[PDB]
Amino acid sequence: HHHHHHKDEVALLAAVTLLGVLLQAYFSLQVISARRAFRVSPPLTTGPPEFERVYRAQVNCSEYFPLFLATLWVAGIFFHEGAAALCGLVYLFARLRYFQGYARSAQLRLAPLYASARALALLVALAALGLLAHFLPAALRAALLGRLRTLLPW
Amino acid sequence: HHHHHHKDEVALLAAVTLLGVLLQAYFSLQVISARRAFRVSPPLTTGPPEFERVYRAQVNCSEYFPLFLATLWVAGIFFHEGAAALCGLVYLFARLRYFQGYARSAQLRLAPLYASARALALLVALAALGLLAHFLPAALRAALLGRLRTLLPW
Amino acid sequence: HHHHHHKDEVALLAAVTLLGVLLQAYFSLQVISARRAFRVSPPLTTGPPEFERVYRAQVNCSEYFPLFLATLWVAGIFFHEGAAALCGLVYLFARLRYFQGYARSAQLRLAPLYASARALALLVALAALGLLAHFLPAALRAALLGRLRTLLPW
Ligand SMILES: CCCCCCSC[C@H](NC(=O)CC[C@H]([NH3+])C(=O)O)C(=O)NCC(=O)O
Ligand SMILES: CCCCCCSC[C@H](NC(=O)CC[C@H]([NH3+])C(=O)O)C(=O)NCC(=O)O
Ligand SMILES: CCCCCCSC[C@H](NC(=O)CC[C@H]([NH3+])C(=O)O)C(=O)NCC(=O)O
Ligand SMILES: CCCCCC/C=C/CCCCCCCC(=O)O
Ligand SMILES: CCCCCC/C=C/CCCCCCCC(=O)O
Ligand SMILES: CCCCCC/C=C/CCCCCCCC(=O)O
Ligand code: NI
Ligand code: NI
Ligand code: NI
Ligand code: NI
Ligand code: NI
Ligand code: NI
Ligand code: NI
């Protein structure tokens, strides 16, 4: 304390973040369940195709989850919190579908994969635009000022 | 600047975070050390059971580390910083024990694994409660207001 | 809102963060491209040495990316934003070189690997120093105060 909080500026990003964590946890329990169904004991991550697909779905989601988080927060802070949260929700939903698809067949992972990549790319673009909005004016001003300069003439 | 900082509201979360990083680094050096002991050269992540166990312990910890971070921060901001840090400390300790256990035997990874999952689940519950506390009143109010509405009667 | 923002205190950390995301994405597209070149279809992460090297380069980078993020932010907030961003830039550049090297040969991954580890270690040290600066005075004061205590004597 501090007589103000910035919780209000980030609660939706936080809610989507927690939702993402819960979804990852879900994936983990699904991998353990495939480990019982197809009798694959730790360590060792090879087995029947269906296990390898479930396993691999969880691994890919894990690898993308920090990318999602980073961009979600940057976009939400630099561009717009609500838009970022929406894209995040779409992303996470796409990822749930990716995992389910993959579990059934490699080919069925593909449509939700593409959906998830577009949402992520949108998040990136918002992050980039937000950062650009932050930095570009001061930079342009500094460049104009140096040019100015001229002076003691004109 | 800014004539105030919010460092004070997050320093314990930050300290636990750094501690978590250091522990992950430690795991990494342990995997490289198992790579020398059992002669496994990159790439390739298969070898004797003990190497595969050490390797796999490091991989699982890596996969859970972002989940831990996300929830630690949400819990610490939305619920209570100290509680979140404590759960985080317990989690990380549980994880150190998980890795050591696993290195010795798959079965010995199990007790600290369960300890780590409970701490994580507690962190999730705090995150959830904190978010609920943030959103639920305004929502309930908005719902009551819409009902009210009635009016120009009663 | 809130009539101030802390975007200004973190924009460089955010820019480096986004840059890191873009680099990871790049690595991902490189793995998919190696999957087409050497005909390796999902799931299954074994194949010719060059594929396994590209794959493995992407995996290692993925595993270190959250460590990098955590420390980058802690260092940037607790120590100095600009220094942290610089180290981050060096780190990410080192990582680009690590991935390219690895893709060509296991041995060529080694020099940029070491460069990346030093930048990361520097980030850790800054995080640690920043945290120490935050906590150590109050602690020392509290300890001196308890000693003081004496009193009603001296
Ligand atoms: C908005 C920009 C986002 C970047 C997308 C880049 S390509 C997609 C991405 N490719 C990878 O992750 C490559 C590595 C992955 N670990 C693998 O073994 O295939 C993927 O979905 N891999 C898993 C899959 O193919 O299902
Ligand atoms: C509080 C909620 C947290 C969610 C816990 C879900 S189950 C535990 C978790 N399961 C997984 O990670 C599955 C995937 C893992 N990569 C594997 O190959 O087994 C685990 O500890 N795997 C490694 C292990 O079994 O040691
Ligand atoms: C500043 C402190 C940072 C900590 C560095 C610790 S050692 C380096 C690190 N070792 C590991 O990641 C071990 C696990 C890795 N997954 C593997 O299979 O080799 C690495 O670069 N592995 C990949 C590689 O050797 O290229
Ligand atoms: C590791 C991933 C990145 C996490 C970074 C999140 C940091 C947030 C700090 C700034 C919060 C201040 C309020 C936001 C300002 C605004 O909404 O315009
Ligand atoms: C990617 C993981 C999530 C990281 C998010 C952390 C963002 C912090 C921004 C808000 C900080 C403001 C002070 C906290 C307010 C409080 O303690 O009540
Ligand atoms: C999960 C990785 C860690 C993310 C944490 C980032 C949280 C930032 C909250 C505090 C921001 C307030 C401004 C910084 C104060 C300063 O620069 O001295
Ligand atoms: Ni104040
Ligand atoms: Ni006060
Ligand atoms: Ni403030
Ligand atoms: Ni101010
Ligand atoms: Ni001033
Ligand atoms: Ni204000
Ligand atoms: Ni106002």
Numbering used by the authors:
A (entry chain A), B (entry chain A), C (entry chain A): -4 to 149
What does the paper say about this structure?
Leukotriene (LT) C4 synthase (LTC4S) catalyzes the conjugation of the fatty acid LTA4 with the tripeptide GSH to produce LTC4, the parent compound of the cysteinyl leukotrienes, important mediators of asthma. LTC4S is a trimeric integral membrane protein and a member of the MAPEG (membrane-associated proteins in eicosanoid and glutathione metabolism) family, which also includes three microsomal GSH S-transferases, 5-lipoxygenase activating protein, and microsomal prostaglandin E synthase 1 (9, 10). The crystal structure of human LTC4S has been solved and identified a unique horseshoe-shaped conformation of GSH bound at the active site by residues from two neighboring monomers. It was postulated that the lipid substrate LTA4 binds in a hydrophobic crevice between two monomers and that Trp-116 could act as a “molecular ruler” for binding of LTA4 with its ω-end buried under the aromatic side chain.
We exchanged Trp-116 in LTC4S for an Ala or Phe residue and analyzed the effects on catalysis and kinetic parameters. Considering the inherent variability that comes with enzyme assays with highly unstable lipid substrates, no major kinetic alterations were observed, thus demonstrating that Trp-116 is not essential for catalysis. To further probe the role of Trp-116 for the positioning of LTA4 at the active site, we solved the structures of W116A and W116F LTC4S in complex with analog I, at 2.7 and 2.4 Å resolution, respectively. Comparing the omit map densities between the WT structure and the W116A mutant, it is clear that the acyl chain of analog I is less ordered (data not shown), which coincides well with previous proposals that the function of Trp-116 is to anchor the tail of LTA4. Hence, Trp-116 appears to aid in the positioning of the ω-end of LTA4 but this substrate-enzyme interaction seems to have very little, if any, impact on substrate turnover. The sulfur in analog I in the W116A and W116F mutants shows a larger shift of ∼7.1 Å. In the W116A and W116F mutants, the three terminal carbons shift by ∼3.5 Å upwards toward the position of the Trp-116. This is most likely due to the larger space available in the absence of the tryptophan residue. The increased Km values of W116A/W116F for GSH are probably indirect effects of changes in LTA4 binding.
